[model samples]
Target: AANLYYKCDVGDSVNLEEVLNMDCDAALTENRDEHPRIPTGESHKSYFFTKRACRDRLGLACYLLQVYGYPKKYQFSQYSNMEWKVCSLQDIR
Candidate 1:
């Protein structure tokens, strides 16, 4: 299969620390199956947001959300580990 990427943006008012913490929490709990159990690991801890285009199945979610004005709490199962989580430019391809 081709590499697929995920993407989203965080509003200026949104907090990155909180987002990161929540994602860590999700990765440990709700997303235990999909994400790493130890979220802070060197390989799992780092996340990215880029200016490049998302790819394949993943980008479909990003494109739709982008069209909808990028809601504050949108969940893209392709990347999101929990509900009510803010979307960011994550390249998990």
Candidate 2:
């Protein structure tokens, strides 16, 4: 699996498992259309996914992060303020 890292606009770094857990919980409950929210009450905007993580997770199937876009292999120089749509898998599919 690829080593992927997730960070939100508020400088909150997150793990793939954390994101998955929250997303799964929401999907299985009331907010089926909601994405994982950060401590600042917002969703992640930038992602740093290793090629393996990209291939292993989003590349293989539809997931919460996949709803934004395919993972980019390069790391962002100034990603903390970058913005992206917080969409759900069903919204994109």
Candidate 3:
């Protein structure tokens, strides 16, 4: 979790396990998509990052969940104040 450069805020000092929706393996891939140019025809499981950080306060690791578009842009805000979404811990094993 230290290798990842990101964060999460779901209240505080709370059990992140009960908070996040886990459903897959956990891995942190850098924010470097080669889509829009090369153009990926299908979707895959991976993380698209704009920056980096360690495990969040909730104690659960994070990863951007992009099921469509290889080089898809960050679709949310607030968390980490940048791209990349948090991983669902329980589902990831």
TM-score leader: 2
Select the stronger candidate by lDDT from 1 and 2: 2
Displacement of residue 73 (Cα, Å) in model 2 is: 16
Per-residue accuracy of model 3 over 1-93 as CA lDDT, tens digit each: 322221244322222332222223544343355322122455444433222333343333233433445454222211343433343222222
TM-scores of the candidates in the order shown: 0.19, 0.28, 0.20
Tens digits of per-residue lDDT, candidate 1, 24-50, equal: 323333223433233223222323232
- Superposition error at 82 for model 3 (Å): 24
Arranged by TM-score with the best first, the candidates are: 2, 3, 1
Candidate 1 regions exceeding 4 Å error are: 1-13, 23-27, 30-86, 89-93
- Could you tell which candidate, 1 or 3, scores higher by lDDT? 3
Query: Each prediction's Cα RMSD?
Result: 14.3, 14.1, 11.7
Model 1: clashing residue pairs? Answer: none
Show the colliding residue pairs in model 2: 2-52, 2-53
